[PDB]
């Protein structure tokens, strides 16, 4: 029926296996979490529901079992720079949304259900643009990101793309959901990083970054911006 690719095959085995791996081998030590119950709640959030009627409220319980909250001073946001941001985070022992329990579970997966069926639709899922924005995949990421930003604390960093005309996209999840919900009085450092072998098309002085400074002022978040750095200069030396 839908225009988007179907659900990841064996989605529920994957999220349970990743849950075991994460809670036991990647980030253990804190409180215990039951991975069976986390998988059950994840599945119950969307399974057998209208795939284009997802609400943020459908995920409150799942998120409550494992909020996406990162230790003070270790949190990293990104926008149009996913792989660079993850390399940077890994090197510096920081955490992106993909390094939280739920983000780790969901990273790179697709899922949707179908009314009157207990199973995932593995043939097609709603596309955000061609079908509906109110789909379980897109809504999960928006609500998880919101909670991610609300829990941020002390210094947080963001990696943005200085090779685009607008390194800050106000219609992005970083622009629309994360920056505007960022816990007040944290401090944000932005790095605008450009493709090796190309001059940067955006800077800290550009229009888009001015919009971001405006948002951060309203949250009483201090802002430091660095730019004109190649991926190599940025990584080799932030
Ligand atoms: N871990 C993920 N795995 C798969 N898809 C994801 C993931 N995280 C987000 N998406 C989706 O892919 C899309 C990415 O769109 P960009 O324009 O490159 O960047 P932003 O929108 O700013 O999202 C990134 C920030 O917000 C949350 C934090 F992770 C980041 O700081 C997005 O719409 C999501 O539906
Ligand atoms: C430093 C960085 O992330 N550069 C990205 C590049 O990977 C991508 O091809 C392009 C278009 O999305 O955006 C820019």
Residue numbers in the entry: 41 to 278
From the paper:
Altogether CD38 appears to be a key player in the biosynthesis of calcium messengers which are involved in a wide range of cellular functions. Thus, the catalytic transformation of NAD+ involves the formation, via a ribooxocarbenium ion-like transition state, of a unique reaction intermediate that partitions between several competing pathways such as an irreversible hydrolytic process leading to ADP-ribose and a reversible minor pathway that governs the formation of cADPR. The L-shaped structure of bCD38 consists of two distinct domains separated by a cleft and connected by a hinge region. The active site of bCD38 consists in a funnel-shaped cavity with a fairly rigid structure; it buries the NMN+ moiety of the substrate and its scissile bond in its deepest non-polar and least solvent accessible region, whereas the AMP moiety interacts with its more solvent-exposed region, at the entrance of the catalytic cleft.
In agreement with observations on hCD38, incubation of crystals of wt bCD38 with rFNAD and aFNAD resulted in stable covalent intermediates whose structures could be resolved at high resolution. In both complexes, residue Glu218 was found covalently linked to the anomeric carbon C1′ of the fluorinated-ribose ring in an axial (α-anomeric) configuration. Comparison of the covalent complexes obtained with rFNAD and aFNAD allows observing subtle differences that distinguish the way the active site of bCD38 accommodates both ligands. With aFNAD, while one active site (chain A) clearly favors a unique conformation similar to the one observed for rFNAD, the second site reveals the presence of two conformations of the covalently trapped intermediate. It is possible that the fluoride atom in aFNAD slows down the ‘adenine flipping’ described above based on the comparison between the Michaelis complex and the covalent-intermediate obtained with rFNAD. Subtle differences exist, however, within the covalent complexes obtained with aFNAD. Furthermore the carboxylate of Glu218 shifts away from the center of the pocket indicating that the conformation of the side chain of the catalytic residue and that of the 2′fluoroarabinoside are particularly affected in the covalent complex with aFNAD.
